[PDB]
Amino acid sequence: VRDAYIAKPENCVYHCAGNEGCNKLCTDNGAESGYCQWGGRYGNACWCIKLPDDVPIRVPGKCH
């Protein structure tokens, strides 16, 4: 498991403006919880806690 920004294809974070949406997005994908991280390195985006190793995460680079 890992704490990181969950990504959708291809290497794209989920923009957010509220913790609830991230919490639901993260837990729907196996994480224990999530919240919206403001002003991070990938903008305001969903951060998941204990996201499974098999769920993609945002890595350095662009979203495409």
Side-chain angles (χ1 to χ4, degrees):
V1 291
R2 66 280 201 78
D3 295 357
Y5 292 101
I6 182 164
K8 56 197 154 170
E10 314 178 13
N11 200 36
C12 308
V13 296
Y14 283 77
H15 174 255
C16 51
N19 283 352
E20 195 264 337
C22 294
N23 193 40
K24 181 66 174 24
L25 167 70
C26 297
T27 56
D28 276 351
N29 288 292
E32 147 183 327
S33 57
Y35 56 77
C36 183
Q37 180 59 55
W38 271 269
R41 137 183 2 262
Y42 304 120
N44 299 332
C46 295
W47 174 264
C48 304
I49 301 321
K50 283 195 175 347
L51 184 69
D53 290 339
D54 51 340
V55 179
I57 63 172
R58 181 65 151 81
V59 309
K62 295 160 336 170
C63 152
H64 32 104

